[PDB]
Amino acid sequence: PNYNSTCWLWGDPHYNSFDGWSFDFQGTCNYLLAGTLCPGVNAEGLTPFTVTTKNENRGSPAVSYVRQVTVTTLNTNISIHKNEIGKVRVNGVLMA
Numbered sequence: 001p002n003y004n005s006t007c008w009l010w011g012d013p014h015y016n017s018f019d020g021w022s023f024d025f026q027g028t029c030n031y032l033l034a035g036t037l038c039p040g041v042n043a044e045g046l047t048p049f050t051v052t053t054k055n056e057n058r059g060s061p062a063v064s065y066v067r068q069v070t071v072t073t074l075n076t077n078i079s080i081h082k083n084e085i086g087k088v089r090v091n092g093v094l095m096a
């Protein structure tokens with residue numbers, strides 16, 4: 001239980017994995033940052049979870065940055081954009 005790690009995503013993008021690994025992958029449409037077991041192998045007492053992000057260019061083909069971040073757990077999807085407020089609820093209504 002004491003074990004705890006993090007995925008550190010740095011804009012302009014640069015990724016730091018849970019394990020110690022860094023790379024400079026870039027993309028243009030939404031990707032699966034993390035989620036449940038895609039093959040469904042060795043899962044006990046699993047709970048749904050999925051975090052996905054979307055990237056796009058900013059003026060040069062070779063650079064991409066993060067625009068929106070989405071999560072989805074327990075029949076509840078949370079979406080965040082660059083608007084300083086929530087916009088998180090299932091319907092997508094803006095929230096404080």
Ligand SMILES: *[C@@H]1O[C@H](CO)[C@@H](O)[C@H](O)[C@H]1NC(C)=O
Pocket residue numbers: 002003004005
């Ligand atoms: C990992 O467990 C919780 C989960 O976020 C966190 O608050 C805590 O600070 C972390 N503990 C350690 C030892 O890294």
